[PDB]
Amino acid sequence: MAHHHHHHVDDDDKMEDTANPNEMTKDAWLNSMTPLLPDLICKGFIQDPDLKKRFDEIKMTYEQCVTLIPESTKKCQDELYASMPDKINSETAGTWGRSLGECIGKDFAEKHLIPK
């Protein structure tokens, strides 16, 4: 901004642009979401005294959870991936994140928490 009447700009906006990831794409979101799920999923069975009942019944441990959860992370990923939009906003993340969580919490349970 130094020319009002005389505009002879053959070049401009050279350094005045940088594409920064405002939010994460559906793929990038999954990538940065999947391995963080095991952390929260196990805690879900620990924080809830209700759920902790079965957690201790099978003598299951935190580490045992996070080695199994990667099975369901990939599972529910492909589930919702088909329904997810191109890019995942912070708000969008929570919506689909809890969706992954509910899937996994069910998958993990029927697998090892259910002795049948």
UniProtKB/TrEMBL annotation:
Annotated ranges, domain T2SS substrate NttA: 23-116
Keywords associated with the record: Signal
Top-level lineage group: Bacteria
Protein name, per record: T2SS substrate NttA domain-containing protein
Source species of the chain: Legionella pneumophila
